[PDB]
Design a protein around this motif. Structure first.
Motif, PDB file in Angstrom:
ATOM      1  N   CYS A 176     -28.947  -3.185   1.045  1.00 49.74           N
ATOM      2  CA  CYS A 176     -27.995  -4.111   1.646  1.00 49.74           C
ATOM      3  C   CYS A 176     -26.583  -3.872   1.127  1.00 49.74           C
ATOM      4  O   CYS A 176     -25.628  -3.830   1.910  1.00 49.74           O
ATOM      5  CB  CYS A 176     -28.429  -5.550   1.382  1.00 49.74           C
ATOM      6  N   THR A 177     -26.431  -3.704  -0.186  1.00 53.45           N
ATOM      7  CA  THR A 177     -25.102  -3.542  -0.767  1.00 53.45           C
ATOM      8  C   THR A 177     -24.510  -2.180  -0.435  1.00 53.45           C
ATOM      9  O   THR A 177     -23.349  -2.078  -0.021  1.00 53.45           O
ATOM     10  CB  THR A 177     -25.165  -3.730  -2.282  1.00 53.45           C
ATOM     11  OG1 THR A 177     -25.642  -5.045  -2.586  1.00 53.45           O
ATOM     12  CG2 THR A 177     -23.792  -3.549  -2.887  1.00 53.45           C
ATOM     13  N   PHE A 178     -25.292  -1.121  -0.605  1.00 52.20           N
ATOM     14  CA  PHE A 178     -24.796   0.237  -0.477  1.00 52.20           C
ATOM     15  C   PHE A 178     -24.976   0.810   0.917  1.00 52.20           C
ATOM     16  O   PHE A 178     -24.608   1.966   1.143  1.00 52.20           O
ATOM     17  CB  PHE A 178     -25.482   1.137  -1.501  1.00 52.20           C
ATOM     18  CG  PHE A 178     -25.210   0.746  -2.917  1.00 52.20           C
ATOM     19  CD1 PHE A 178     -23.954   0.908  -3.460  1.00 52.20           C
ATOM     20  CD2 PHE A 178     -26.208   0.214  -3.704  1.00 52.20           C
ATOM     21  CE1 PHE A 178     -23.704   0.550  -4.766  1.00 52.20           C
ATOM     22  CE2 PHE A 178     -25.963  -0.147  -5.007  1.00 52.20           C
ATOM     23  CZ  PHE A 178     -24.710   0.023  -5.539  1.00 52.20           C
ATOM     24  N   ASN A 179     -25.541   0.041   1.843  1.00 52.39           N
ATOM     25  CA  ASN A 179     -25.585   0.398   3.258  1.00 52.39           C
ATOM     26  C   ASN A 179     -26.192   1.786   3.460  1.00 52.39           C
ATOM     27  O   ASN A 179     -25.564   2.708   3.982  1.00 52.39           O
ATOM     28  CB  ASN A 179     -24.187   0.304   3.877  1.00 52.39           C
ATOM     29  N   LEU A 180     -27.435   1.921   3.019  1.00 55.04           N
ATOM     30  CA  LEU A 180     -28.174   3.169   3.123  1.00 55.04           C
ATOM     31  C   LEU A 180     -28.953   3.179   4.429  1.00 55.04           C
ATOM     32  O   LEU A 180     -29.609   2.191   4.775  1.00 55.04           O
ATOM     33  CB  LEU A 180     -29.118   3.334   1.935  1.00 55.04           C
ATOM     34  CG  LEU A 180     -28.507   2.953   0.587  1.00 55.04           C
ATOM     35  CD1 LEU A 180     -29.542   3.049  -0.513  1.00 55.04           C
ATOM     36  CD2 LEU A 180     -27.297   3.823   0.281  1.00 55.04           C
ATOM     37  N   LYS A 181     -28.883   4.292   5.151  1.00 51.23           N
ATOM     38  CA  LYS A 181     -29.468   4.359   6.482  1.00 51.23           C
ATOM     39  C   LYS A 181     -30.985   4.456   6.402  1.00 51.23           C
ATOM     40  O   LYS A 181     -31.576   5.453   6.823  1.00 51.23           O
ATOM     41  CB  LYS A 181     -28.882   5.542   7.249  1.00 51.23           C
ATOM     42  CG  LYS A 181     -27.366   5.507   7.333  1.00 51.23           C
ATOM     43  CD  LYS A 181     -26.765   6.899   7.461  1.00 51.23           C
ATOM     44  CE  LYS A 181     -25.391   6.962   6.808  1.00 51.23           C
ATOM     45  NZ  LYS A 181     -24.536   5.814   7.207  1.00 51.23           N
ATOM     46  N   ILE A 182     -31.618   3.413   5.874  1.00 50.54           N
ATOM     47  CA  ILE A 182     -33.069   3.343   5.761  1.00 50.54           C
ATOM     48  C   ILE A 182     -33.557   2.462   6.903  1.00 50.54           C
ATOM     49  O   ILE A 182     -34.547   1.735   6.773  1.00 50.54           O
ATOM     50  CB  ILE A 182     -33.501   2.813   4.379  1.00 50.54           C
ATOM     51  CG1 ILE A 182     -35.014   2.946   4.173  1.00 50.54           C
ATOM     52  CG2 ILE A 182     -33.016   1.376   4.166  1.00 50.54           C
ATOM     53  CD1 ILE A 182     -35.472   2.637   2.765  1.00 50.54           C
ATOM     54  N   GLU A 183     -32.828   2.495   8.021  1.00 45.88           N
ATOM     55  CA  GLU A 183     -32.984   1.720   9.264  1.00 45.88           C
ATOM     56  C   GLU A 183     -33.024   0.211   9.019  1.00 45.88           C
ATOM     57  O   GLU A 183     -33.282  -0.533   9.971  1.00 45.88           O
ATOM     58  CB  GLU A 183     -34.191   2.114  10.151  1.00 45.88           C
ATOM     59  CG  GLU A 183     -35.613   1.817   9.644  1.00 45.88           C
ATOM     60  CD  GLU A 183     -36.211   2.897   8.753  1.00 45.88           C
ATOM     61  OE1 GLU A 183     -35.478   3.777   8.263  1.00 45.88           O
ATOM     62  OE2 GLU A 183     -37.433   2.830   8.504  1.00 45.88           O
ATOM     63  N   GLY A 184     -32.778  -0.266   7.798  1.00 50.37           N
ATOM     64  CA  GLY A 184     -32.694  -1.690   7.533  1.00 50.37           C
ATOM     65  C   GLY A 184     -33.957  -2.486   7.802  1.00 50.37           C
ATOM     66  O   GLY A 184     -33.899  -3.541   8.441  1.00 50.37           O
ATOM     67  N   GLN A 185     -35.104  -2.001   7.324  1.00 52.01           N
ATOM     68  CA  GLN A 185     -36.376  -2.669   7.575  1.00 52.01           C
ATOM     69  C   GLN A 185     -36.759  -3.666   6.491  1.00 52.01           C
ATOM     70  O   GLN A 185     -37.515  -4.603   6.763  1.00 52.01           O
ATOM     71  CB  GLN A 185     -37.491  -1.632   7.720  1.00 52.01           C
ATOM     72  N   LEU A 186     -36.265  -3.492   5.272  1.00 48.45           N
ATOM     73  CA  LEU A 186     -36.668  -4.360   4.175  1.00 48.45           C
ATOM     74  C   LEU A 186     -35.939  -5.698   4.230  1.00 48.45           C
ATOM     75  O   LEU A 186     -34.751  -5.766   4.555  1.00 48.45           O
ATOM     76  CB  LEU A 186     -36.407  -3.668   2.839  1.00 48.45           C
ATOM     77  N   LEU A 187     -36.662  -6.770   3.909  1.00 50.52           N
ATOM     78  CA  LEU A 187     -36.095  -8.105   3.779  1.00 50.52           C
ATOM     79  C   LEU A 187     -36.603  -8.724   2.490  1.00 50.52           C
ATOM     80  O   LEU A 187     -37.811  -8.738   2.244  1.00 50.52           O
ATOM     81  CB  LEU A 187     -36.467  -8.996   4.964  1.00 50.52           C
ATOM     82  N   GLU A 188     -35.685  -9.245   1.681  1.00 49.80           N
ATOM     83  CA  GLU A 188     -36.051  -9.763   0.371  1.00 49.80           C
ATOM     84  C   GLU A 188     -37.003 -10.943   0.504  1.00 49.80           C
ATOM     85  O   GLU A 188     -36.911 -11.745   1.435  1.00 49.80           O
ATOM     86  CB  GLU A 188     -34.800 -10.183  -0.399  1.00 49.80           C
ATOM     87  N   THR A 189     -37.938 -11.038  -0.433  1.00 53.74           N
ATOM     88  CA  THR A 189     -38.912 -12.118  -0.410  1.00 53.74           C
ATOM     89  C   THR A 189     -39.548 -12.228  -1.783  1.00 53.74           C
ATOM     90  O   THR A 189     -39.333 -11.392  -2.661  1.00 53.74           O
ATOM     91  CB  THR A 189     -39.984 -11.894   0.661  1.00 53.74           C
ATOM     92  N   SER A 190     -40.338 -13.279  -1.952  1.00 49.01           N
ATOM     93  CA  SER A 190     -41.132 -13.485  -3.149  1.00 49.01           C
ATOM     94  C   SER A 190     -42.543 -13.863  -2.729  1.00 49.01           C
ATOM     95  O   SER A 190     -42.778 -14.331  -1.613  1.00 49.01           O
ATOM     96  CB  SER A 190     -40.533 -14.567  -4.053  1.00 49.01           C
ATOM     97  N   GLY A 191     -43.488 -13.643  -3.633  1.00 48.77           N
ATOM     98  CA  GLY A 191     -44.880 -13.843  -3.304  1.00 48.77           C
ATOM     99  C   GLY A 191     -45.495 -12.730  -2.493  1.00 48.77           C
ATOM    100  O   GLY A 191     -46.627 -12.879  -2.023  1.00 48.77           O
ATOM    101  N   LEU A 192     -44.783 -11.620  -2.310  1.00 45.04           N
ATOM    102  CA  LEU A 192     -45.339 -10.483  -1.596  1.00 45.04           C
ATOM    103  C   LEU A 192     -46.482  -9.880  -2.390  1.00 45.04           C
ATOM    104  O   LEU A 192     -46.405  -9.742  -3.612  1.00 45.04           O
ATOM    105  CB  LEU A 192     -44.270  -9.427  -1.348  1.00 45.04           C
ATOM    106  CG  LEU A 192     -43.251  -9.752  -0.267  1.00 45.04           C
ATOM    107  CD1 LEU A 192     -42.337  -8.575  -0.047  1.00 45.04           C
ATOM    108  CD2 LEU A 192     -43.953 -10.139   1.010  1.00 45.04           C
ATOM    109  N   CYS A 193     -47.561  -9.544  -1.688  1.00 42.63           N
ATOM    110  CA  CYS A 193     -48.702  -8.867  -2.291  1.00 42.63           C
ATOM    111  C   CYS A 193     -48.622  -7.398  -1.888  1.00 42.63           C
ATOM    112  O   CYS A 193     -49.298  -6.936  -0.970  1.00 42.63           O
ATOM    113  CB  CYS A 193     -50.005  -9.522  -1.856  1.00 42.63           C
ATOM    114  N   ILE A 194     -47.767  -6.662  -2.585  1.00 44.30           N
ATOM    115  CA  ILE A 194     -47.546  -5.250  -2.258  1.00 44.30           C
ATOM    116  C   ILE A 194     -48.789  -4.450  -2.628  1.00 44.30           C
ATOM    117  O   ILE A 194     -49.280  -4.567  -3.762  1.00 44.30           O
ATOM    118  CB  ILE A 194     -46.314  -4.720  -2.986  1.00 44.30           C
ATOM    119  N   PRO A 195     -49.328  -3.634  -1.723  1.00 47.77           N
ATOM    120  CA  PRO A 195     -50.559  -2.901  -2.034  1.00 47.77           C
ATOM    121  C   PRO A 195     -50.343  -1.915  -3.172  1.00 47.77           C
ATOM    122  O   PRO A 195     -49.235  -1.430  -3.402  1.00 47.77           O
ATOM    123  CB  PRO A 195     -50.881  -2.182  -0.723  1.00 47.77           C
ATOM    124  N   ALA A 196     -51.427  -1.634  -3.901  1.00 45.62           N
ATOM    125  CA  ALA A 196     -51.342  -0.740  -5.052  1.00 45.62           C
ATOM    126  C   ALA A 196     -51.048   0.698  -4.639  1.00 45.62           C
ATOM    127  O   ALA A 196     -50.305   1.403  -5.328  1.00 45.62           O
ATOM    128  CB  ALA A 196     -52.632  -0.806  -5.861  1.00 45.62           C
TER     129      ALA A 196
END
Lengths: 334, 417
Positions: A176-196
């Motif tokens: 978000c800050t550095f405006n990297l062309k990663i197509e902007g798919q990530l959205l900040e959150t908490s409680g995410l259960c990110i797979p191992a």
């Protein structure tokens, strides 16, 4: 800021001087209270060194910050592995370190970037939580880009769910800050259960960031090669996986008419050659992934071969380096 | 006597071609010819994809005895041969089917065992075997059977759940549909041998094993929510606050991840207000109230407890279903042709009016909370369900189930009217 230099001396004054169980528990409670007091006092406190011997602000600030940071890290790294105090004291110390770091932006991360890799994943999680806050406050933040990207990408594929969540939030902030062309798919959150098993996700993120945004391509490479030595075997495999997509970009910053850029590329190649010579367990992987990809680009062959020859001269005939590079010449040739 | 080629530290004559080629390829790299051997293996795999079964069996057998560097080479030059297995998938031979089953089982055992090269092992073997759309059914069936043999919370079960993410990386739609459909089918087929609660059923192990598959595939929209949202909501409604604390936490994380994927999917363009509602929903779902509503209370974080190995009231389920319906209807204001409420209403009314000891008390409340148009047949069925439940409570000793079903019918009437 004056009393900080006093209670810092008080803090961990007897971190290893305890001799009795009752004494150990009482000292641990006193340390917990003193750590709470220091954490509260440093919350938002600017780091203004006392007027020195005609010194610039940068040097005095760095010296004072480093003194406190090393004191706190010595306290905490000894605080792992009184029995009940081991967790509360650790959390108090890391909260104090966070409150110190957040206060000073261009007096901090320079000496704090080494806490991202750490050994205590709980410590790293808090560190990336802190950096996320800092980057949202709308060493210059130009070189911080790749150095932070490497830390976030490496820490996604960790073995603790909290660590992965912290790393994901860090990438969200950095994109978000550095405006990297990663197509902007990530959205900040908490409680995410990110797979191992995030190997494919981290590898794809790195590949897209490299192709779309080959802006840095040097700080990231230097940081990744540096941290490849500091990681574990599984994370060594993951790091090689997402560093292979970036080694192609080194061609553009090789023929540039800058002595510093050429020296940086040469240092990167030397570090890669050293990694090849030292890492013997996964040798075929390192060959076929790094050198088998570096060979496919025509421009960098001269630099790579010259680095091989110089390291061969340095290592000496019959040395491990000479044999390793003679063999790796086969990988480069293919 | 061909086994001596797989030496220590320094019979149909047709398939022995591969059985000897494996020995040759492995031995070429013994003590840097890795690139040459790998290229030779790839070229042989492409230009001469005749056997592709004896060679794979031999290579899998020889991988066990090799050295770590030899294991690296073996994986490198054997990964090109896994893609060619697609040919012997639609083949109409029982013996070939058994051979493929054995090969897949051996690869599963290798993935579970050699944990050192685990990132590379996954990305090479499963990251390639996933894309072959013909073999997805066989792969998933073997996965489920291995997980069942391990059981819930097993090392094999966890490893299969983790490797399902790698398999679904390639074909997200197919693997996602297979897992969701199998879980829904198991839940429906539970209605043939009723038991007082799901945790007492015979198919509970299957349900628990397949739930973690959705937990691991929820992240990063590997379930294709924009097509399977109604079934996900149906499963969650039947799973909320059921089973052990690990499964309760898994259900909470599944809901959070489904909402996140819906909020970060690019296949459904949303207006500002819709995305704001979704972000607010994700913010609210982590509040201390919903932790008690899911039964995962007195836990610092759901993810920390979940990635490791209390009485439930229908009012809580009503609150949870209302929240989910709010999120779903907030999403539906943008998708003009969405038939999601129709699908969920159908799958709820299916379980509402068919007898079951555990699924009916939940299903009636969910149907009442979700329904948009009731008719006199539904009302009569609900009233008769109340009457029959009262009669059973009066006669049968099972007081708890009958009281819960009576309460469910009363709540369903309260919402429906």
């Amino acid at each position: 800021n004056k009393m900080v230099e006093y209670l810092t001396d008080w803090v961990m004054g007897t971190s290893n001087q305890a001799a009795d169980d009752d004494v150990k528990c009482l000292t641990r409670d006193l340390d917990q209270a003193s750590m709470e007091a220091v954490v509260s006092l440093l919350a938002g406190l600017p780091l203004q060194p006392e007027e020195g011997d005609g010194v610039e602000l940068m040097e005095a600030k760095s010296q004072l910050f480093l003194k406190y940071f090393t004191l706190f890290m010595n306290l905490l790294n000894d605080c792992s592995e009184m029995s009940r105090r081991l967790a509360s004291l650790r959390h108090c110390t890391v909260l104090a370190m966070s409150n110190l770091l957040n206060a000073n932006v261009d007096s901090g991360l320079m000496h704090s970037i080494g806490l991202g890799y750490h050994k205590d994943l709980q410590t790293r999680a808090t560190f990336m939580e802190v950096l996320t806050k800092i980057l949202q406050q709308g060493i210059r933040p130009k070189d911080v880009p790749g150095t932070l990207l490497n830390i976030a990408l490496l820490n996604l594929g960790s073995s603790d769910p909290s660590l992965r969540s912290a790393a994901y939030n860090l990438l969200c902030a950095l994109t978000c800050t550095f405006n990297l062309k990663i197509e902007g798919q990530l959205l900040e959150t908490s409680g995410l259960c990110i797979p191992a098993n995030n190997t494919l996700f981290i590898v794809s993120i790195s590949k897209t960031l490299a192709a779309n945004e080959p802006h840095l391509t040097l700080e990231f490479l230097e940081e990744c090669i540096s941290g490849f030595s500091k990681s574990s075997i599984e994370l060594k495999h993951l790091c090689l996986e997402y560093m292979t997509p970036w080694l192609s970009n080194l061609v553009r910053f090789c023929k540039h008419n800058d002595d510093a850029k050429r020296q940086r590329v040469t240092a990167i190649l030397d570090k890669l050659i050293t990694m090849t010579i030292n890492e013997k367990q996964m040798y075929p992987s390192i060959q076929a992934k790094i050198w088998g990809s570096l060979g496919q680009i025509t421009d960098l062959l001269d630099v790579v071969l010259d680095s091989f020859i110089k390291t061969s001269a340095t290592g000496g005939l019959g040395s491990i380096k000479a044999e390793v590079m003679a063999d790796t010449a086969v990988a480069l040739a293919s």
